[PDB]
Amino acid sequence: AAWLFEA
Amino acid sequence: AAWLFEA
Amino acid sequence: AAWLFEA
Amino acid sequence: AAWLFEA
Amino acid sequence: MKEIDELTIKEYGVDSRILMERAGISVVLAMEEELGNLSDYRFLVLCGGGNNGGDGFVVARNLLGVVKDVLVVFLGKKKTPDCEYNYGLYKKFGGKVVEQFEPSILNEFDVVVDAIFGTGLRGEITGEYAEIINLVNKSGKVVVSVDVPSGIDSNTGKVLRTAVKADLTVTFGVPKIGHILFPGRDLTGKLKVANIGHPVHLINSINRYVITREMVRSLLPERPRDSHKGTYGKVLIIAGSRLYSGAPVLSGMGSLKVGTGLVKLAVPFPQNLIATSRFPELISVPIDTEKGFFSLQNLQECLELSKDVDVVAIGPGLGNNEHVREFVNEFLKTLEKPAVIDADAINVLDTSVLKERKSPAVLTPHPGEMARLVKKTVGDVKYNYELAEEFAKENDCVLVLKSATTIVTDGEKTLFNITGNTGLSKGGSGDVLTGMIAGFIAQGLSPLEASTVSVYLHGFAAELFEQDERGLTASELLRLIPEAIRRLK
Amino acid sequence: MKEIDELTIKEYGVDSRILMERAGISVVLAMEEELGNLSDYRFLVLCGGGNNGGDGFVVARNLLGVVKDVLVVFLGKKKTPDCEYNYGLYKKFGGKVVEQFEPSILNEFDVVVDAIFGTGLRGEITGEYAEIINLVNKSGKVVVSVDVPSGIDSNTGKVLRTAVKADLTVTFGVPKIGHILFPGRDLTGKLKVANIGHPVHLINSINRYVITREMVRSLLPERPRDSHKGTYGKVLIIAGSRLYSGAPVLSGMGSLKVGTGLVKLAVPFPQNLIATSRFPELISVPIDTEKGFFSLQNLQECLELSKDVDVVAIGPGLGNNEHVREFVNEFLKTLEKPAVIDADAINVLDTSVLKERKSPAVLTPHPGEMARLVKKTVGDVKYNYELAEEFAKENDCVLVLKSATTIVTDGEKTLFNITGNTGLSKGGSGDVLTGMIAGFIAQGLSPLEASTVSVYLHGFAAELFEQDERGLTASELLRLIPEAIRRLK
Amino acid sequence: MKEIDELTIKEYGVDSRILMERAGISVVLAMEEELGNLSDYRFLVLCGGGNNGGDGFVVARNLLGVVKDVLVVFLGKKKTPDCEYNYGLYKKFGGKVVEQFEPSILNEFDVVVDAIFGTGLRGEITGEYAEIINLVNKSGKVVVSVDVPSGIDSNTGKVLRTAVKADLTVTFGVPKIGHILFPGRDLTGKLKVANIGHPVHLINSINRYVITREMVRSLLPERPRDSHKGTYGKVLIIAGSRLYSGAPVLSGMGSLKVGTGLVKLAVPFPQNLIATSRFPELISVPIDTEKGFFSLQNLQECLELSKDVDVVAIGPGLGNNEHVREFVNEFLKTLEKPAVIDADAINVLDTSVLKERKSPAVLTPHPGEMARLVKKTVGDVKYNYELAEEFAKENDCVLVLKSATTIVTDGEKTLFNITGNTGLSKGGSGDVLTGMIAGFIAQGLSPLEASTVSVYLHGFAAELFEQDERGLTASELLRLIPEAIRRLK
Ligand SMILES: Nc1ncnc2c1ncn2[C@@H]1O[C@H](COP(=O)(O)OP(=O)(O)OP(=O)(O)O)[C@@H](O)[C@H]1O
Ligand SMILES: Nc1ncnc2c1ncn2[C@@H]1O[C@H](COP(=O)(O)OP(=O)(O)OP(=O)(O)O)[C@@H](O)[C@H]1O
Ligand SMILES: Nc1ncnc2c1ncn2[C@@H]1O[C@H](COP(=O)(O)OP(=O)(O)OP(=O)(O)O)[C@@H](O)[C@H]1O
Ligand SMILES: Nc1ncnc2c1ncn2[C@@H]1O[C@H](COP(=O)(O)OP(=O)(O)OP(=O)(O)O)[C@@H](O)[C@H]1O
Ligand SMILES: Nc1ncnc2c1ncn2[C@@H]1O[C@H](COP(=O)(O)OP(=O)(O)OP(=O)(O)O)[C@@H](O)[C@H]1O
Ligand SMILES: Nc1ncnc2c1ncn2[C@@H]1O[C@H](COP(=O)(O)OP(=O)(O)OP(=O)(O)O)[C@@H](O)[C@H]1O
Ligand SMILES: [K+]
Ligand SMILES: [K+]
Ligand SMILES: [K+]
Ligand SMILES: [Mg+2]
Ligand SMILES: [Mg+2]
Ligand SMILES: [Mg+2]
């Protein structure tokens, strides 16, 4: 789940 | 962790 | 091992 | 815990 | 809450657009937590013309370019200013809106976001609104409702002709009464409560609460190591008859399983012997009656017995006939102890007696009993928290109105219990709760506190039953109470 | 013990400084066992001017250069010679002492070592001593008490105005009565008993003991394979009434669950039928009474029944009225068997009867019953082991004075039981213990031995309850006894 | 990016306040993901007067009433309009701001939120700004930077006199160059990139990228089952000398371990024999030289050898003397194949040759080699992506400028590699990467694509070393390449 944050 | 959501 | 301490 | 003994 | 939005905008100075952005992104995060990665899903967002719809436009806009497909069906006529602003953003971001709904439209989407009506629903839903809600309900898609499922009155939980059945509801700030009472509780599906930036002071000012594990944990009485049975109080249960011999046993053990020091039953002979043959820890005093029912002949023995206790529970299995009515009312009028009044003692209660008592009382009716007590229909009293509050306030008591969601009120503070399951929908369940409440009062909790902890634990014990809930009986419920207690800590 | 220090110094020739060094290092080792590595902690050591303080200076000095920070607050006026010597060492080693205590001083430390007062406490704590103890108690730091928490009278366990609440207490040689009786037992927290070099002969000469698992293991009766029920004795329980039908059942099963061969109850008809409907292994003899209570009319049947048994328990649920008084006293006067005398048989007992009996007796009162038996207040008898000893010695009996710490004495030997929890603070608990004691006597243990094993196992069974202790009832206690037995071996 | 904020506000119509709210809440969510529950922590939020500070006020305000303590130190003079608005909200919500910083202030807080300067930092940090940053850096608290650690120039990664060392940096939209290049990369600590509501179109329009696992996965060449070695290309490596016999072996195996079909080395006799004694899969052609170095005498044999290959790598271990210079330049001028030019072939390269070649080239210097190639100092070329871009564009090549972050550019597209560790800071590492790049070109990737995949995989293989990275050698690096490949898929 990656709607808010990329790393 | 509960800043955003309570259930 | 109980030379020093009893509980 | 090393108050008494070093090895 | 719309009050709480109002204050947060006009007094605290938070732009209404900032609240609406925060609401919408909460929905997106909530959906990701429930569905996992959103990138493989196609979303149909149904938007009304109000602030709920505006929240929907925020959702739609934040999904653009990140999921497989988004389409908004705009179902309103006019748009409020924040809805209009967010519609404008959705389109500037390249989003697609249609205003006509086609029955086959559900076919190309996986998830329906229901942003039609929130707390601004007024009156029955008809027309294209209804047709569309009915289509969504037949579709088998995943349904996420914004704030409240459209068609639920958020003040009562009633369905206004038709309503969305949601898999997930994301509400803002605090749960609404319509998520807590049925049918709305059922239509909400899984409820998430999102912080959208209201000052904490305003969130905590709400006077109606859902009973939570942390609340019950903090209310549980202490068990000091240097203690004895007298530390934990004494209960008298006046209960049973030649017809109903089992009720006393279940009430008495309900008191013992919550930690009460001593429990005495007063039960007509020889029915009193039933209790000790099952649980020899109980004291079951034989009451000599003319025909197997308490009457005024037993008034004086019962008052003597009450002198050495902290609380008296009365009513389970007493029967309801004239001599029982006379006894119950004369007893409660003279008793200067807290009373827990249940079942047949409610059915014969003269409510004038409650007004004249100096000592406190808790009443524990189901809606049939409440309906006979205030001379209304079951339909008018069921889930009627305002009626419960009025009754508690006028009669100086705690009212515990039992149902799948139980309401507990003293007229000033109202709490809602959502633990439990359908295994409690069976004779004997109520009798256990009566004993529990009396037990906690005897341990030193206030009538309201005792009722709050007891309804929660009673329902929680039910959920701990290891097999199918329909097979749960009161005896097994009792065995489960100490595990509910352990799990709470 | 201060006797034991005295002898070890003056007769055995151990330098007092060597005892004090050994005491202090015990504290350091104990703390390491409980906190793990000490090197990351900052220590505040509070030292009085006496030998407890001297022990504190040893602690402080041995932590120097090995932990993050040590500070001593010296709170006394003068210093005894060993305290002065160890103060001198602490400072020669580079240690810091202040004599003023500042409320904010707790802020810079993680662990408080309480070496203010040990067994030399005389009178109520006031002044800066009190203020400082109250500050430590509000601080939330880890608190380690040297010898006894300061403010506990080590002879009685009473708080002398105010006292330290410790997480860990390290005491020297043997536990003190103040660690064993409440409130002191509660304030001690976890107790470690350190060997500081007293001759073993002097440690073993103490006449008051804590009942331990090894003591109870070695007292448990043998079960020879070639045996039959008669090997394991026979108990008669004279118990119950029309009011209290459950008590006999719990006493009788208490005897059977500890291994007794045969148990007979004598209970008023039809209440006797209660016992066999729950546990058909019991023999429950119906006693024909005028009004539901034992009276002199039943004297002769009860004495006949007693002839074929090894022990008689009497009292649980008898009621307390004149005819019961007459019966109990005439029975015990004539009975030439060991008697276990409980509950209502205590409340009507004429203590002259105990003096004239040739056969032994065990009495098992709670403090309310003891208080009525010696005509004192509950406050004067509770935890009063010297009163219990006098009573046992004067009346030629074993006294088992029940409370969270139970005292068991025959007037010469006194034992303290510390097993159990608050689930036993509930009606029926006592009735079980009565049956247990009778059962072990029937198996061939002396009255004191039977009482010692029974109080331990009764409390231990309670601790084995799998759910929250407040939900424990006597019936579940019974089920747990054979597991307590297994775990003991 | 400030462009991207500008467009999103002025063209798309998103209120700047909505971007700032979204930024601040991202920081709160990020901190919760890293610290767990925030409710037990005390927060010190340091806010400048600009938009970074405004983001800080949002953070502070959203923590109010939910954590143990929040304090803002406002360090600016004036406030921009959004900072002022959010300051006003923080105070209306009951938040505390001070304008003086006291060295001991760090003592009462657990977490420092650094919202002093973001991308609006201009010039060296001095005064109270510096003093405060230095205090935070000495404090040992957990440090969370908003957008970029204050003091890092977000365009270059350089420290402007002093800068915050963060445990966690939360940046908005896309990573900045200052998070990617050192020292800024080191000071960023763990980097989270938050979506704050920019249109996806604008986020994707950025022309400088960090090479990611998904990018490399999608670039990896296919391995059709019906294939043979010719499917996977042929590489010639012209390498080595009497002085440097090992370099050819490492380059050649670097090509084979990435899937190349055939690798031929041309190496001076007898040094060519070194390669096949270690890896007999290699073809190592003996080149007859006068004194152990390639010269013009070998021009014609090398061009013949190049005719049957797809790519030529040249330079590792050639030596650097006049005859090698003549050979390398005459070779590259005539070679009509892609060339990978490394090490000593760079040190003698005439850059005019690169302009006149019709065929492509990749150059792989470290900063010392780049510095000699453009006649600048190492300090002027190191991490100078704009210089690298200019050089690539002017000379029609791909430049791979090696360092802990490697820059890969063709003058139009620039990529940054962040895989790898210090075990690659050792002779032989570069030689392996050369072979890898040539190998992927031979397999059909473009020079830029081959360089992109190779730098990522080369660094990733290093991170897979099972023991301490300082013990990694090129030979072990080779063994790890096929595991890096497997893990990528
Ligand atoms: N029963 C109904 N049938 C058709 N339209 C309705 C019905 N009830 C409400 N609406 C329309 O939907 C609008 C909802 O707008 P409004 O912002 O007041 O409430 P909302 O969208 O539920 O948002 P909120 O939850 O913030 O109150 C109403 O003003 C009304 O015009
Ligand atoms: N579906 C359900 N979900 C949760 N709780 C339930 C459900 N059905 C019943 N209960 C609970 O079980 C108890 C039923 O008590 P009530 O007195 O209403 O019925 P009863 O058959 O009379 O029990 P009794 O025979 O002991 O009097 C109440 O606490 C009620 O809230
Ligand atoms: N209630 C009190 N208030 C103030 N000071 C007291 C109080 N009780 C005792 N003290 C002081 O503390 C001293 C303790 O010294 P002493 O060595 O006799 O006992 P101690 O420190 O408890 O050591 P030990 O445990 O070996 O007896 C006493 O002699 C007395 O001066
Ligand atoms: N907090 C506690 N911790 C340990 N033991 C306890 C605690 N409270 C009670 N007990 C034990 O439980 C038993 C209580 O017996 P007692 O006769 O005092 O009370 P009771 O209610 O009269 O039991 P019964 O109804 O069987 O007569 C005693 O052994 C006592 O030591
Ligand atoms: N080196 C410095 N020393 C002191 N103050 C500075 C320094 N650099 C910048 N500032 C101040 O901090 C302000 C930062 O405000 P601005 O909104 O332009 O950038 P920011 O806070 O980094 O936000 P953003 O990241 O959106 O650009 C500058 O306008 C300037 O007044
Ligand atoms: N600390 C580091 N982190 C990541 N990558 C590193 C680090 N140090 C070196 N490298 C990488 O290792 C390789 C070193 O090649 P370079 O040619 O610069 O050194 P080398 O000793 O000459 O290797 P060779 O002897 O094969 O020529 C480059 O890809 C570089 O990016
Ligand atoms: K809705
Ligand atoms: K002490
Ligand atoms: K910053
Ligand atoms: Mg009922
Ligand atoms: Mg008793
Ligand atoms: Mg190199």
Structure in words:
This is part of a larger assembly, with four copies of chain A (about 5 residues) and three copies of chain E (about 500 residues). With about 5 residues, chain A is an all-beta fold. Chain A has no helices and one strand. In chain A, about 15% of the residues are buried. Chain E folds into two domains: about 1-205, YjeF N-terminal domain (Rossmann fold), CATH 3.40.50; about 205-489, 3-Layer(aba) Sandwich (UDP-N-acetylmuramoyl-L-alanine:D-glutamate ligase). Chain E has helices at about 1-10, 15-35, 50-65, 80-90, 125-140, 175-180, 185-190, 200-205, 215-220, 245-255, 270-280, 300-305, 320-335, 345-350, 350-355, 365-375, 380, 385-395, 430-440, 445-465, 475-489; strands spanning about 40-45, 70-75, 95-100, 110-115, 140-145, 170, 190-195, 210, 235-240, 260-270, 285, 310-315, 340, 360-365, 400, 405-410, 415. Chain E is α/β, with parallel strands linked by helices and about 500 residues long. The longest helix of chain E is centred in the N-terminal third of the chain and has 20 residues, at about 15-35. The two termini of chain E are about 30 Å apart. The interface of E and F includes residues 232, 257, 277, 279 and 481 of E. Bound molecules: adenosine-5'-triphosphate (6 copies), potassium ion (3 copies) and magnesium ion (3 copies). One adenosine-5'-triphosphate (ATP) binds next to α3 of chain E.
